[PDB]
Structure 1
Amino acid sequence: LKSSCKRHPLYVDFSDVGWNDWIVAPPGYHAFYCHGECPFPLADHLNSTNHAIVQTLVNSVNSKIPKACCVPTELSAISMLYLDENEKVVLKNYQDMVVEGCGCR
């Protein structure tokens, strides 16, 4: 997979990770994930920080310095039914669960 930094699909099934013992609902969700290369140069359509730009140029002159990394730059939350520490089944929000966008950092 040599494409550029973009979001890829990914459904997480809690029972496949051993979380169905504390997560009552849902059975899993679409978390997605980022992947792809952060190349020189970083095109217009790439969300990047000044440092990522700086680091990318360094990688072009010195391969010993790694390229910027393709990580989530925008996330969203989800609610979850689960059992808390007090043994009560509560329904709360969980931030930074679903990858909404990808960028170079």
Structure 2
Amino acid sequence: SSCKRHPLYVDFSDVGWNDWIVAPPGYHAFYCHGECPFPPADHLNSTNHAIVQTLVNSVNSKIPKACCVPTELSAISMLYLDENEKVVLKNYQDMVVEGCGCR
């Protein structure tokens, strides 16, 4: 199982966020999971350090492989109540995973 994007729906109720987030009720946030390959994957986004750590891992194991994380994020708009109970329409950055990579 290599580093790839996975489905994930968040219900603001489960996390108890529905007490301040008017709408939406929840959303598709997605998430990243998977093993960072070696030899390093081709069409897979990766930083120099991540490549180096992946190599060090093959020889020494006390050092963990690179981690599969969101490399591309988009936002969602939400209707919520702030500190003074003022309805607010705000765009929230970095909420939805659109791409994963090794870091």
Which TM bucket (shorter chain)? over 0.9
Following TM superposition, by how much is the alpha carbon of 1:101 offset from its aligned partner in structure 2, in angstroms?
0.1
| TM-score normalised to structure 1 length | 0.96
Q: CA RMSD in A?
A: 0.6
Any unmatched runs of 5+ in structure 2? none
- Distance between the aligned counterparts of 2:11 and 2:3, measured in 1? 25
- Distance between the aligned counterparts of 2:27 and 2:68, measured in 1? 22
Which ranges of 4 or more aligned residues in structure 1 deviate by more than 3 Å?
none
Q: How many residues align?
A: 103
Following TM superposition, by how much is the alpha carbon of 1:86 offset from its aligned partner in structure 2, in angstroms?
2.2
Following TM superposition, by how much is the alpha carbon of 1:39 offset from its aligned partner in structure 2, in angstroms?
1.9
Any unmatched runs of 5+ in structure 1? none
- Distance between the aligned counterparts of 1:50 and 1:92, measured in 2? 36
Following TM superposition, by how much is the alpha carbon of 1:45 offset from its aligned partner in structure 2, in angstroms?
1.5
- Distance between the aligned counterparts of 1:61 and 1:40, measured in 2? 12
- Distance between the aligned counterparts of 1:74 and 1:42, measured in 2? 19
